[PDB]
Amino acid sequence: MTRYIFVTGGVVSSLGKGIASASLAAILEARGLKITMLKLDPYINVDPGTMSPFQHGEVFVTQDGAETDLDLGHYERFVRTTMTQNNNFTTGRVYMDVLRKERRGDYLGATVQVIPHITDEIKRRIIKGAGDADVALVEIGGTVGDIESQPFLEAIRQLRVEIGAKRAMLMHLTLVPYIATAGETKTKPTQHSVKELRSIGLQPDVLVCRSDHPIDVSSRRKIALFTNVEERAVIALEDVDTIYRIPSVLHAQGLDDIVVERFGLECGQADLSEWDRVVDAKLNPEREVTIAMVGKYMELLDAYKSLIEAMTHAGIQSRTKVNLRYIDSEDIEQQGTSLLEGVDAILVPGGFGLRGVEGKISTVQYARENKIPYLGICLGMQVAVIEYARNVLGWSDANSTEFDKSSGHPVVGLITEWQDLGGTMRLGAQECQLQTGTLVHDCYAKDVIVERHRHRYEVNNNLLPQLEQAGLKISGRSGDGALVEVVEAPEHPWFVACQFHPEFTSTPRDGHPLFSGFVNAALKYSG
Amino acid sequence: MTRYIFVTGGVVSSLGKGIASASLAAILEARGLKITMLKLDPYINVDPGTMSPFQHGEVFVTQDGAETDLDLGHYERFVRTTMTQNNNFTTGRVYMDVLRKERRGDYLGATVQVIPHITDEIKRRIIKGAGDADVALVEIGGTVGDIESQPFLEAIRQLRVEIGAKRAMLMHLTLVPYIATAGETKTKPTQHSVKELRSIGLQPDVLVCRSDHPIDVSSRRKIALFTNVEERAVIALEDVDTIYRIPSVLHAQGLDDIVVERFGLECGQADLSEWDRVVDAKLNPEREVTIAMVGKYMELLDAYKSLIEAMTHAGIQSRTKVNLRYIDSEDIEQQGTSLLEGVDAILVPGGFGLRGVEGKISTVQYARENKIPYLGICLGMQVAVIEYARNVLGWSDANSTEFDKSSGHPVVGLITEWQDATGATEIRTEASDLGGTMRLGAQECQLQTGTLVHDCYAKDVIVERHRHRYEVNNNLLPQLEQAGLKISGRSGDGALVEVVEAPEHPWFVACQFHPEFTSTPRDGHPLFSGFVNAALKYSGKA
Amino acid sequence: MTRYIFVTGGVVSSLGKGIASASLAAILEARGLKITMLKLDPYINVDPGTMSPFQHGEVFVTQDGAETDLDLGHYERFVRTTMTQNNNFTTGRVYMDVLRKERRGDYLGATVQVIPHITDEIKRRIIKGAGDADVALVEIGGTVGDIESQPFLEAIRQLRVEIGAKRAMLMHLTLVPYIATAGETKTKPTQHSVKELRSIGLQPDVLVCRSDHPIDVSSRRKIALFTNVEERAVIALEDVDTIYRIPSVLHAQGLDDIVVERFGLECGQADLSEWDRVVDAKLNPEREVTIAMVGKYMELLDAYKSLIEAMTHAGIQSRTKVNLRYIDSEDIEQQGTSLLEGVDAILVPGGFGLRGVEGKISTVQYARENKIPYLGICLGMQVAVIEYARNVLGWSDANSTEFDKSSGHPVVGLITEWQDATGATEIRTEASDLGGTMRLGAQECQLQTGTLVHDCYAKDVIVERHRHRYEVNNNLLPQLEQAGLKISGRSGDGALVEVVEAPEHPWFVACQFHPEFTSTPRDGHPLFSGFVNAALKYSGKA
């Protein structure tokens, strides 16, 4: 009989609900339990695929082929479980499915409503996502008090009522602010959030207090008495130097003890040795390298969370503090490539939109001419191919069908204008064919791998042989070899341009061979 | 500039939101203003067509062909305007079209939320429904305090904020209950409802208090003080003897004066002479008949609201008290036609479901053979055709493909089944998946000269509202025609059978369309008036 | 007609409700208007006199003799008016007087409720406090959402309804927090606070947003849209370098223009020259001293707000940055007077409790013997007298009856103890139950000519605020007088000792009253100014 822990937010968003849930999942994984996590989004977008990064950051891609909330990434980085479309869903999906059922007449002339039809669908989806796992952590997006999250709150209240306290808990994340003029932290907004939760029939069992200043014991006593919650169930989670240390801190407060006591589980004591290794390798580096990063929206909130996490994992597998320099592509366009001097490696990840691609073209040109370790991702391989055609094959006007169609040399383009008209929508996991003796083979140490892709425009095979005889290495193709996947430079110390997004499978406790090789090349350059 | 009056419910449902809104609209129409009304349903059903009558009563059919809430009917019966699909919509349709817009990418990578996307959709639909009307009365379904109606309340709050008090009002319907153990009425539930309204930023401007006992002046003063509304803005609307007197009642309390004062409208004084005539001819009848109606769920709440309204309109147009005997078809099946003795006319309307059609067949047989005036609607015409084929032509097993697809004489069926068929039981079955076989909304109908339907409607070509899938089988129609079954009306092009008549009957008319939808209290309906006069002819004579 | 501006708190407490209200009042005073302010405390303590400083800081003493909230002090420091007991009250006093009215039968057998009896009492007290002022700023203690402040919010809602928008505003203080992990400020808690305000029928008219980080324009646009207030009605009030610049800050955002536009007032443009001078002389000092203050709870939140304000006023009046060293008396007791080395002046203010008086005795001794300027307040004068009797007259065990009633030389005690006594330890003990022994509020004080206090105050008869029970024992005073202890000031009738001075000291003044209560930033205080100039004389010279 599966058991559920519900996670909610309070006062203000951006508390770290996903990080705390993933930390708990890692903690219980260290105890031998099989843990799974779910994300419920209180917006009526069917999937986050259409959503821009300005709203809720990046759009994570799972192995089964779903564009999900970025929090799922944290999940895969804290437990070794593969996430599918069942572990993340939205209010819009629920409403659309119930509308389709009602149009199908499955309700037999009944007044379909939020209660009980919508809540029934939400509960069914939650149970389906839980699967066979011993414990499922269901995170609720948004903050309590918003009317968008009320269906989720009612559904979890119904679940708590139906399966009892032995199989359900409420971990509510709330912020205690430090008021500078008063020189102390205030628990009043937390009390207001707890009152809001009580007014909807939900009594939190654990309170996670977030603050940028220490949370003292007297405040914990007051917050425990003013919410009718046992003292040890008041967890203080402050701003930390690294997220991977959060499982330690929580363990130091016996919250996993509370979970196992409430659920009546029998398993061994938590072994956090691996996370201790991660935190030790993060806070105590030995080497140091600065890697450039060029794109469109770099410092945007959680816009490239998976990519930065992957590069941190690569630097942590090699004990290097990977300093990052973020340069906008338009800065390179209107100022020249001179902003890139002094770096030891250059990265071009997937760009959001169409503006400022000539800047990335100049960037890959500068990286390849100056023999600086270059790794391109998605749009990176596309701009690398375009630049290589421009500066080796001499096609000055070579471009892609994404951008200005005034291009007599479309080295990258949609399949339809080859061999409107819809879109390929190349999304999800796919099989790969590496080439022997290449850098990709030198890193992956195999010829068959499974990685995730989020592209639509591919490399045109019409002009492929001309580039192939021009020196452009084809170090990887699709699972059948039909399309170009990853390319390399012939006379470069390290130059890989891949269509897929490898940063999604990178974890802190295992790293990623390609990113590790990129970091090692960066150290080889100067470090 | 369009002006809006919002209508809300409180305490409990079934207060009469639609009736009160329609009465106010009638009052304003009597002042010369051009009024329209809208109905917003807080359920996620796309349209009420799939909904059973057990939930929210009948399913009205508009002229443009939409299945809407029954309240729209009230609208057309209180002002002389025509409702379209823009005048009624639901949370389900709003959510579905917003989801389709999001899938189209029309939001350009934006987080679609209840606020402001859903509220924007609701407001746009309100504006589109309002049209060029001087005043639009927007009614909100459900009761205040349910989470289902929160988007609508938020949208009307945004409207109030955006266009100001000179173009917006809130008329909130509440219930003051009479506590028998205390011998007085309590204002506490109304105060709680007003508190719930205040919690969502909505302050009522007019209060319509509903009770089965008189609402005394001290209660009005307390309810105005405890909710910070002027005394004259508290309207007492008790259970009345007939709904058509509510326009008078409200007019006696200066509700229209309040509307005109707030909106700054310049119009003539209210003239309720037509409604006075209606109430006088409804409350003081001179003649009296007893008309039987056999059906499926007769006494169910508001299941046949439009048809009973049509009968009331026919009765008032003739100053006759049409007492009605509701009989279940299964009762006729298990007890015989002897339950029909003593009536002056017999009705078989559209049936809700498939159970007990044989009862209606026997009812049609008894009505025809004993020369008792009969009018059939939708299923009524179908069962009339089936019974006529059974008892005249000798086709004992004749039926409709709705009930028996193995019948050797399918006198009623879908168009595809007998469109191009050799004859007899050439039913292609397979459920005839077409979807559009359901004729819905206004369609033309040509009436043969010299028939009862032509005598009533008095025009050669009429227009009426359809809601039906099963038609008359044209491959066997000539045999019925030469057997004496009169075809008194056909479709706008003549391809399909519309209204039929008996050959040797004082009055026997069966129409496929629903005439009760275009029946109004101030104008009546020629068909129902003729049917009631036929019952008057039968009364006393037989 | 009196006009009201209401001030409320949100999210968390300690936003600066009183400071913001006083700053707005100062702005309006600069326009020539006659402003007053009121403080409404949502606790059932009758007056804050019994309350400890740990709860809500110091206990202010008004001229008429009332123990009030510290916020009243801010009032007197921002406009040149005097606060009375009508300008501050609590839920406890309202409930107690309503209960007394009910016991008197003044309600004539009526069910006394929160609405309308308590609200009526609160409104009447608001009107009485407002007086003849053109504008009254009524501040509500606590944070919106607590059930303790609901009566006050309901009362101000009733006021808004009754006198209209032309005589009422709501300026709501809220907190926008900077989330370090997100690198931006969140408006969600403010929106929740506004929702809580809307749930009780209160719509804010001005929003004062408080943060430690800049409030960008997009946040202001979002916070105005999501709460349906005009953009110019969103005021950004961040943590400032000094509070006296808030009148400038708000004036730069047209808050006074909003107040004038809403209330329809006709007055001259704001002239903040005095506040500009204050901020310039506070933020850009030229000299610098370090003054020691030894006490009981020195760094406690707002425990000595008026006294630190008085020191700031004295410093700005002399363009000197008065750095302050806070030292606990017990630290002096257990470590010696060596913690005092390096300072230019020494202060011993009124003590909160009875612990560590020997430390203050040693502090007075060290200040006198080493010719370091000393000013004592309330307990300061008492310990000065005790130390002078101990170390000059040789009365080693001399003390006050507050701490030692068995002392053979009670140089300080209650009036009844030595009123008619033979001499020496004729203490009647029994706690001297009088209640009125506590001198409170404004009393006169005659100053001897040619003394330091007369040089500072420059007048023969002054008026100052008292809060003290223990007086100087007149049965032993002549011995102190002939021992060299100067009696530089006595009561309005001369019966009691008020201010004393050392005979061979550069500056040594000990006053029984509290001068910090009448100290203002735009006018300073002669006593504190003289003390700071004495420290300036000591600085460099010694």
Token output for C102: 């009910």
Measured CA to CA, the distance from residue B254 to residue C401 in angstroms comes to 79
- Chain A residues lying within 8 Å of B108, measured CB to CB: 52
- Among A499, A510, A466, A289, smallest CA distance to A375 is for A499
Q: Report phi then psi at C106, rounded to 5.
A: -70, -15
What number of other Cβ atoms are within 10 A of residue A254's Cβ? 14
Say if residues C453 and C488 touch (Cβ distance below 8 Å).
yes
* Chains with 3 or more CB pairs under 8 A to chain A: B, C
**What does DSSP assign to residue B186?**
-
Measured CA to CA, the distance from residue C225 to residue B518 in angstroms comes to 46
Residue B87 vs residues B80, B139, B187, B414, B515: alpha-carbon distances, Å = 15, 10, 33, 31, 21
Measured CA to CA, the distance from residue C473 to residue C494 in angstroms comes to 14
**What does DSSP assign to residue A209?**
E
User: How many residues appear in chain C?
Assistant: 542
Q: Which listed residue (B29, B58, B121, B378) is catalytic?
A: B378
**What does DSSP assign to residue B7?**
E
Say if residues A119 and A154 touch (Cβ distance below 8 Å).
yes
Say if residues A248 and A255 touch (Cβ distance below 8 Å).
no
Token output for A55: 């709203």
Measured CA to CA, the distance from residue B403 to residue B397 in angstroms comes to 11
- Among B306, B277, B270, B311, smallest CA distance to B293 is for B311
Measured CA to CA, the distance from residue C359 to residue C374 in angstroms comes to 15
- Among B477, B517, B495, smallest CA distance to B377 is for B517
Give CA torsion, residues A47, A49, A53, A58, to 10 deg. Answer: 90
What number of other Cβ atoms are within 10 A of residue C376's Cβ? 27
- Say how far residue B364 (Cα) sits from the centre of its chain: 25
Measured CA to CA, the distance from residue A478 to residue A121 in angstroms comes to 38
Measured CA to CA, the distance from residue B320 to residue B285 in angstroms comes to 5
CA dihedral over B526, B530, B533, B535, signed as positive or negative = negative
Beta-carbon separation of A14 and C175 below 8 A: no
Say if residues C509 and C534 touch (Cβ distance below 8 Å).
no
Peptide bond between residue A116 and the one before it cis (omega within 30 degrees of 0): yes
Say if residues B348 and B356 touch (Cβ distance below 8 Å).
no
- Among B312, B298, B211, smallest CA distance to B524 is for B312
| A55 known member of a binding site | no
Beta-carbon separation of C183 and A301 below 8 A: yes
Which residues of B have a CB under 8 Å from any CB of A? 43-46, 50-52, 54-56, 92, 95-96, 98-99, 102-103, 105, 107-115, 117-118, 147-148, 150
- Among B200, B90, B193, smallest CA distance to B139 is for B90
What number of other Cβ atoms are within 10 A of residue A226's Cβ? 14
SS3 assignment, position A190 = helix
Q: Name the one residue in this structure whose structure tokens are 């943060």.
A: C211
> Would you tell me the crossing angle of helices A71-78 and A305-317 to the nearest 10 degrees?
20
Measured CA to CA, the distance from residue B513 to residue C364 in angstroms comes to 107
Measured CA to CA, the distance from residue B295 to residue A339 in angstroms comes to 85
Measured CA to CA, the distance from residue C355 to residue C333 in angstroms comes to 11
Measured CA to CA, the distance from residue A180 to residue B133 in angstroms comes to 57
**What does DSSP assign to residue C304?**
T
List of residues 6+ apart from B293 with CB closer than 8 A: B304, B307, B324, B325, B326, B327, B347, B349
Token output for A244: 């991977």
Question: Secondary structure of C107-165 in the HEC alphabet?
Answer: CCCCCCCHHHHHHHHHHHHHHHHHCCCCEEEEEECCCECECCCHHHHHHHHHHHHHHCH
Residue at C146: amino acid letter: D
SS3 assignment, position C26 = helix
- Chain B residues lying within 8 Å of A148, measured CB to CB: 113-114
**What does DSSP assign to residue B424?**
S
- Chain B residues lying within 8 Å of C162, measured CB to CB: none
Chain C contact probe: residue of A19, A148, A184, A188 with most C CBs at under 10 A: A188
- Among A27, A3, A9, A44, smallest CA distance to A126 is for A3
Say if residues A420 and A467 touch (Cβ distance below 8 Å).
no
Expt. technique: X-ray
Measured CA to CA, the distance from residue A72 to residue A57 in angstroms comes to 12
Say if residues B204 and B195 touch (Cβ distance below 8 Å).
no
What is the enclosing helix (H) or strand (E) of B313?
Answer: helix B305-317
User: How many residues appear in chain B?
Assistant: 542
What is the enclosing helix (H) or strand (E) of A432?
Answer: strand A426-434
What number of other Cβ atoms are within 10 A of residue B241's Cβ? 9
List of residues 6+ apart from B428 with CB closer than 8 A: B416, B417, B421
Measured CA to CA, the distance from residue B352 to residue B365 in angstroms comes to 21
CA distance A111 to chain B (A): 6
Give CA torsion, residues B36, B41, B156, B202, to 10 deg. Answer: 120
Pairing of strands C410-413, C399-400: parallel
Say if residues C412 and C470 touch (Cβ distance below 8 Å).
yes
Residue at C458: amino acid letter: A
Measured CA to CA, the distance from residue C257 to residue C270 in angstroms comes to 9
- Among A301, A10, A14, smallest CA distance to A176 is for A10
Measured CA to CA, the distance from residue C333 to residue C343 in angstroms comes to 18
Measured CA to CA, the distance from residue B364 to residue B358 in angstroms comes to 10
What number of other Cβ atoms are within 10 A of residue A135's Cβ? 25
Say if residues C24 and C171 touch (Cβ distance below 8 Å).
yes
| A290 known member of a binding site | no
Peptide bond between residue C116 and the one before it cis (omega within 30 degrees of 0): yes
- DSSP result, C30-64: HTT--EEEEEEE-S--SSGGGS-HHHH---EE-TT
Measured CA to CA, the distance from residue C504 to residue C482 in angstroms comes to 14
Q: Which listed residue (A251, A453, A455, A501) is catalytic?
A: A501
* Alpha helix (H) residue ranges in A202-339: 217-225, 246-252, 255-263, 273-283, 305-317, 329-335
* C514 classed as catalytic: yes
Token output for B247: 């326009």
Give CA torsion, residues C51, C57, C63, C67, to 10 deg. Answer: -10
Say if residues B404 and B386 touch (Cβ distance below 8 Å).
no
Which chain B residue's Cα is nearest to A56? B111
Residue at A462: amino acid letter: N
- Chain B residues lying within 8 Å of C203, measured CB to CB: 201
User: How many residues appear in chain A?
Assistant: 527
- Say how far residue C222 (Cα) sits from the centre of its chain: 37
- DSSP result, A6-59: EEEE-SSS-S-HHHHHHHHHHHHHTTT--EEEEEEE-S--SSTTS--HHHHS-E
**What does DSSP assign to residue C512?**
S
List of residues 6+ apart from B490 with CB closer than 8 A: B445, B446, B448, B496, B497, B498
What number of other Cβ atoms are within 10 A of residue A75's Cβ? 29
Q: Report phi then psi at C291, rounded to 5.
A: -110, 130
**What does DSSP assign to residue B258?**
H
CA dihedral over B151, B156, B158, B159, signed as positive or negative = positive
Q: Which listed residue (C74, C172, C468, C514) is catalytic?
A: C514
What number of other Cβ atoms are within 10 A of residue B471's Cβ? 23
Torsion region of A94: left, alpha or beta (phi above 0 gives left; psi -120 to 50 gives alpha): alpha
CA dihedral over B180, B184, B188, B190, signed as positive or negative = positive
Say if residues A259 and A28 touch (Cβ distance below 8 Å).
yes
Say if residues A497 and A488 touch (Cβ distance below 8 Å).
yes
Burial of C324 per CB tally in 10 Å (0-12, 13-18, 19+): middle
Q: Report phi then psi at B73, rounded to 5.
A: -55, -50
Measured CA to CA, the distance from residue A150 to residue A154 in angstroms comes to 6
Measured CA to CA, the distance from residue A295 to residue A327 in angstroms comes to 7
Question: Secondary structure of C222-276 in the HEC alphabet?
Answer: HHHHCCCCCHHHEEEEECCCCHHHHHHHHHHCCHHHHHHHHHCCCCCCCCCHHHH
Beta-carbon separation of A111 and B45 below 8 A: yes
Token output for B471: 């038609």
Measured CA to CA, the distance from residue A121 to residue A333 in angstroms comes to 50
What is the enclosing helix (H) or strand (E) of B365?
Answer: helix B357-369
> Would you tell me the crossing angle of helices A305-317 and A513-525 to the nearest 10 degrees?
70
Measured CA to CA, the distance from residue C143 to residue A189 in angstroms comes to 10
Measured CA to CA, the distance from residue A472 to residue A81 in angstroms comes to 37
What number of other Cβ atoms are within 10 A of residue C454's Cβ? 18
Pairing of strands C486-491, C234-238: unpaired
Binding positions of C for CTP:
13, 146-148, 186-191, 222
Say if residues A452 and A459 touch (Cβ distance below 8 Å).
no
Measured CA to CA, the distance from residue C92 to residue A88 in angstroms comes to 53
Residue at B250: amino acid letter: L
Measured CA to CA, the distance from residue B479 to residue B485 in angstroms comes to 9
- Say how far residue C384 (Cα) sits from the centre of its chain: 24
Token output for C90: 């609590």
Beta-carbon separation of B44 and A113 below 8 A: yes
Say if residues A78 and A248 touch (Cβ distance below 8 Å).
no
CA distance A320 to chain C (A): 23
> In angstroms, what is the C-alpha Rg of chain B?
25
Taking CB atoms within 8 Å and a gap of at least 24, the contacts of C411-416 are C411/C385, C411/C386, C411/C472, C411/C473, C411/C476, C411/C480, C412/C382, C412/C385, C412/C386, C412/C470, C412/C471, C412/C472, C412/C473, C413/C470, C413/C471, C413/C473, C414/C469, C414/C470, C414/C471, C415/C471, C415/C496
Measured CA to CA, the distance from residue C372 to residue C507 in angstroms comes to 8
SS3 assignment, position C445 = strand
Token output for B258: 């309040």
Give CA torsion, residues B20, B26, B27, B32, to 10 deg. Answer: 150
Q: Can you list the positions of beta strands (E) in B176-250?
A: 178-179, 184-185, 206-211, 234-238
Cβ-Cβ pairs closer than 8 A, A with C, add up to 59
| B41 known member of a binding site | no
Residue at B39: amino acid letter: K
Measured CA to CA, the distance from residue A198 to residue A208 in angstroms comes to 17
